[PDB]
Amino acid sequence: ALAKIQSVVNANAQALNSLLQQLFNKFGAISSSLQEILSRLDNLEAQV
Amino acid sequence: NFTIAGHEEFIQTSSPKVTIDCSAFVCSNYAACHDLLSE
Known part of the structure; x- marks a missing residue:
């Protein structure tokens, strides 16, 4: 069960990390x- | 009467497992086609 708790925390942090990257x-x-x-x-081409 | 009769239920506890080879699905190996994916 402690590992399960950690997997919850880790998976959540990991999701956020992948989003960040x-x-x-x-x-x-x-x-x-x-x-x-x-x-x-810094021009219209850049805007595209 | 005291009759007795059958009943049944399907449940569907599970489903097929699927995987996808991402990038192979997107492109057959055409070299630079895959390079664009890495880009």
């Missing part, structure tokens, strides 16, 4: 996040 997937175009794209373009 989706931020760094490119899902497409280069530089998966934030200002890196903006720094190169």
Whole structure:
């Protein structure tokens, strides 16, 4: 049962961790996040 | 009467187990097709 408790805590933390790491997937175009794209373009193309 | 008769129930306790080879499902191995998936 202690292991079961831990598995609950761990699975929940893990779900959140995997969610957190989706931020760094490119899902497409280069530089998966934030200002890196903006720094190169900052224009309508970047908006796409 | 004191009659006796049968009854029955299906229940459905379980179902088939399925797995999917993600990325193979998405693409047959076409090389760079899989590379786009890693991208």
